[PDB]
Design a protein around this nucleic acid. Structure first.
Lengths: 171, 197, 191, 136, 106
RNA sequence: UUUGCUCCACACAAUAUAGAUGGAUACGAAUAAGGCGUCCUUGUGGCGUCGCUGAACCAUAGCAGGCUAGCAACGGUGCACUUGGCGGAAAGGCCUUGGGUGCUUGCUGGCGAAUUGCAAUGUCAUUUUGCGUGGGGAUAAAUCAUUUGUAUACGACUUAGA
RNA sequence: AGAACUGGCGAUGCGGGAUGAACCGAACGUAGAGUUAAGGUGCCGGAAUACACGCUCAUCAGACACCACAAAAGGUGUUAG
RNA sequence: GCCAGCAUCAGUUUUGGUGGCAGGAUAAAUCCAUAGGAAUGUAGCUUGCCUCGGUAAGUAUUAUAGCCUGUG
């Protein structure tokens, strides 16, 4: 769905031999609360000798980013499964918030490489703090000085089925 | 909101126009389509010519007379598309098709009546720029239609008399527009403008 | 990748004025007038300084921007063809049979008449397309010259003459008889 | 003679272009383009009309011929100052674009009674107009 | 004047139906000038009349009326559901029906 | 063939309705371009303006739309006549001259409505046919039977016969 | 052709998969109202010619499990790495 | 007796308007103040050559535009 960024912190269950576990933390992009907890258990089992039954979640806190109005340019690294192998990737999405960038990435992967939600790992999402540190052309294009372009051939949507004059696409 | 709706078919997609019109008849609306020869089908002319030839080889093996009929007129090609979007085999479906007339060019009395368009079927609004499209008049001629030259001649004549009608119309509407401007800034007009008129 | 904006520049010399319609292009020059229909490209034109006319595509793809340079090279050859002109020279190649070529008239249609190609009794008739004038240049043995304003009309008529003299049912690597273009220059060369 | 090329200039988008919101919570208010995100969506701001800063698809808005000077990345405070300085509010009102909209909203508010004045006045104005259209 | 109409124009679309099964107990009505379920909420409960002519006088007229009313909206495009005291014949799909203004909430 | 046929006007019936309930309201062409206004040196011209939907324009008040009076202009509309054109793609309609006539809500007056009782489509449309009047208009063929063979199983075909 | 566990058809209609003993949904007295399943919403056909991001032009395109087929090997076609 | 209209209700349900609260980084934002920084570099200055004034590049970190980040 529309994504939200949560932080999930979990740990192994305390015991007499080893109390005070390490309290691992991980940032998850998910539609709702239940998925964020699930994806944390999914990914944590891939690093440490732990699972849902042998540990606990201590906290979850949704992270909404500082500047929902300033336009960023995000460098994103992923790890996804094709029909034949597993491949890493790096791209940019230029948009207004971190979550909308991930929401673009999932659609972008699903459109170009037919990668569904299950077969995608989001490695890290970072802002490119410096212009001219952009290496892909499709986002480097919009960074020129005094950028301006028209929108030719505008198509009006008609409410009534019949129009009494031929439409014009000026804009 | 209309007894009879006459559609300028030029610059329309045959399938989207057929769908829009088919619904209109099933809802009780009488439709007349004119200028079928200027209808468009999306796809390069070679693509649409092959499709008709693949259609042309389907016939009843043991008697070609009772087989499918391959109608070659631009009006008939549009009619075939519309008949498939209607349950033409039932009494209600036959009643619907009685509310339809498809013409080639703009014949009499429909030549002096208003023509409308269907924007959701119009080619300049539907198709992406650069996409290749076919014109039904050209496609019909390649498969056996005989009256491209007849229709073009009769539309050259019709448009000349139509431009004569419009030139007089523009002269009269200038004369009326001047009168309304003079009759403006009057106390009656001021009160009308206050009410939105 | 849907380039936002790509454009080219069309230089206009002193003696010509480029008059562009919605997308219909007319170039007028000392050698005449040329016209072309460009409605199938969906480009936009704009004049900068009455000596330079730009053409641009906004939000264009691989094929859309590829057609941008083609339009510039079409109008450029339109301007070039009316300032300098296009001249194509073809030679006659034959081993045993002299290829006999003449200009004839058939109801005023200006056909090119070709005889004795490989000893054939066939006469090959090539119409001379309007705007292309053809003269058998002297001081060179077995040469023909085609010239006109539009390159497209000149080159096609040169190609049509070459195409009509193809050798069939033989090893064309050995039987090389035919008329071939040896030069493509300008009428007002080295002006 | 002179070489002539039809200009074909149409409502290019930039920082400072005034847009009109077609659909959404605003649905009819004026806003100014502040940043260009991508070819299909931009960041706008409508502080005078109450429209907040948000990214929006360009299909949700319609550009207006009005334009003014904003530095790129202009926050809400500075757009308000440059909006009043450029006098965009009544420049929009003076245009025939806003007058037709104001005409529609006035025709919708007409009660049954004042729809009776309209017909009475229109017949009076018709009498004067058609009288004038008998001697020319 | 020229106009004496106190009803909204409407067309009888079809019965309530699946693609292979229909319900003749419910009729589908299109109201002119109505394109949303939000707009169609104004005509819920209005009285609907189907007027038709016949060659036989029954009680002092040759015009017969099938009375009904609008029950709820149907779809996203302003179509409404109606139920009549006797089910509409289904020969009248695409026939015109009158949506009266009573009962009134204005 | 016992007064038949056709057209015109109303007179009453029967018949039926794929479904009036103010107006189907007329350039062409382009859509990476156009419409309109104006000007000139008439063009692929200059300048100005418009679109961002018909949510428009026109029409629209009066007993389902009555009866009378005056004022202001000489306009608007319907109707039957009349003058001249245009239209053959299925033209069967469009424009126009003159006079007459009714109405005019362009403005100001007078009289009437009730009781269908608190809603009941509350009946005003056009399809065809028939019987009557009164007023014009015009007085045929085909088939069977006979016959021919350029035809033919029979039908059918092709000829002939006051 | 032959077995294991379970669920089914046989013995079973109904909505859906156009069509079908076995699939999906759901099992059934006679009705009314409301809401849904699986499947769908251009027209046939009840229901958005809904909204959004991309990709594809196919001189045999593609179009929804069971299921009604297509492989190896190739392509400065085009897109992203 | 047959068929309906309205009103006040009861059960089931469908669709709107609106009020008060409680959470979260006691929302993040906008906004206000302060410090620092940068260019897709604003003013100013210099250079280059221009239809007397705007070009082109160098400087210039807010000036005759502003922007970013941190803290409150």
């Amino acid at each position: 769905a529309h994504f939200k960024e949560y932080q999930v912190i979990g740990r192994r269950l305390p015991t007499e031999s080893v109390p005070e576990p390490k309290l691992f933390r991980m940032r998850i992009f998910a539609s709702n609360e239940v998925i964020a907890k699930s994806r944390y258990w999914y990914f944590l089992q891939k690093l440490h000798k732990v699972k849902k039954a042998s540990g606990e979640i201590v906290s979850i806190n949704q992270i909404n980013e500082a500047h929902p109005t300033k336009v960023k340019n995000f460098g994103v690294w992923v790890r996804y499964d094709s029909r034949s192998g597993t491949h890493n990737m790096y791209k940019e999405i230029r948009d207004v918030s971190r979550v909308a960038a991930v929401e673009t990435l999932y659609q972008d992967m699903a459109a170009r490489h037919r990668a569904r939600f299950r077969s995608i790992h989001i490695l890290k999402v970072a802002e490119i703090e410096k212009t001219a540190d952009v290496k892909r052309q499709y986002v480097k294009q919009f960074l020129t000085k005094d950028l301006k372009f028209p929108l030719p051939h505008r198509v009006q949507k008609s409410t009534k089925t019949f129009s009494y004059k031929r439409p014009s696409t000026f804009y | 909101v209309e007894p009879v709706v006459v559609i300028d078919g030029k610059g329309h997609l045959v399938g989207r126009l057929a769908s829009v019109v088919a619904k209109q008849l099933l809802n009780g609306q009488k439709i007349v389509v004119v200028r079928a020869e200027e209808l468009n089908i999306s796809g390069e002319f070679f693509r649409n010519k092959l499709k008709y030839h693949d259609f042309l080889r389907k016939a009843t093996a043991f008697n070609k007379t009772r087989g499918p009929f391959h109608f070659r007129a631009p009006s008939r090609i549009f009619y075939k598309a519309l008949r498939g979007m209607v349950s033409h085999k039932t009494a209600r479906g036959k009643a619907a098709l009685e509310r339809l007339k498809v013409f080639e060019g703009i014949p009499p009395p429909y030549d002096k009546k208003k023509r409308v368009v269907v924007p959701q079927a119009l080619r300049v609004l539907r198709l992406k720029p650069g996409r290749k499209y076919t014109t039904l008049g050209k496609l019909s001629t390649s498969v056996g239609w005989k009256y491209e030259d007849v229709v073009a001649k009769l539309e050259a004549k019709r448009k000349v008399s139509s431009a004569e009608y419009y030139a007089k119309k523009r002269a009269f509407t200038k004369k009326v527009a001047s009168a309304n401007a003079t009759a403006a800034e009057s106390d009656v007009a001021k009160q009308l403008a206050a009410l939105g008129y | 990748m849907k380039y936002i904006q790509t454009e080219q520049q069309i230089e206009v010399p002193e003696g010509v004025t480029v008059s562009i319609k919605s997308r219909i292009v007319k170039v007028v020059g000392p050698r005449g007038t040329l016209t072309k229909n460009l409605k199938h490209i969906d480009v936009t034109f704009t004049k900068v300084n009455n000596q330079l006319i730009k053409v641009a595509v906004h939000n264009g793809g691989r094929k859309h921007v590829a057609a941008l340079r083609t339009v510039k090279s079409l109008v450029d050859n339109m301007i070039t063809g009316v300032t300098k002109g296009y001249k194509y020279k073809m030679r006659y190649v034959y081993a045993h049979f002299p290829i006999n070529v003449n200009i004839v008239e058939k109801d005023g249609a200006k056909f090119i008449e070709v005889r004795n190609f490989l000893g054939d009794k066939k006469i090959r008739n090539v119409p001379v397309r309007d705007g292309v004038t053809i003269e058998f240049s002297t001081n060179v043995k077995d040469e023909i010259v085609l010239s006109g304003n539009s390159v497209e009309d000149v080159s096609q008529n040169a190609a049509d003459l070459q195409q009509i003299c193809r050798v069939r049912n033989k090893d064309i690597r050995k039987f090389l008889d035919g008329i071939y273009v040896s030069h493509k220059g300008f009428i007002t060369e080295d002006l | 003679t002179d070489s002539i090329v039809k200009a074909s200039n149409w409502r290019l988008v930039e920082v400072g272009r005034v847009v009109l919101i077609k659909k959404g919570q605003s649905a009819g208010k004026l806003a100014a383009i502040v940043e260009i995100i991508d070819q299909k969506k931009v960041l706008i701001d409508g502080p005078k009309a109450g429209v907040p800063r948000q990214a929006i698809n360009l299909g949700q808005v319609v550009l207006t011929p009005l334009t003014f000077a904003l530095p790129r990345g202009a926050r809400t405070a500075t757009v308000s100052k440059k909006w009043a300085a450029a006098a965009v509010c009544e420049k929009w009102a003076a245009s025939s674009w806003a007058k037709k909209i104001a005409q529609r909203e006035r025709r919708a508010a007409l009660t049954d009674f004042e729809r009776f004045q309209v017909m009475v006045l229109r017949k009076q104005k018709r009498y004067t107009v058609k009288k004038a259209l008998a001697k020319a | 004047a020229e106009s004496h109409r106190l009803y909204v124009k409407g067309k009888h679309l079809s019965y309530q139906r699946s693609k292979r099964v229909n319900n003749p107990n419910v009729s589908l009505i299109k109201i002119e000038g109505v394109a949303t379920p939000q707009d169609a909420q104004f005509y819920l409960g209005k009285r609907i009349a189907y007027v038709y002519r016949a060659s036989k006088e029954v009680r002092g007229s040759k015009i017969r009326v099938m009375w009904g009313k609008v029950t709820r909206t149907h779809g996203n495009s302003g179509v409404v559901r109606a139920t009549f005291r006797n089910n509409l014949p289904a020969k009248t799909f695409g026939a015109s029906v009158r949506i009266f203004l009573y009962p009134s909430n204005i």
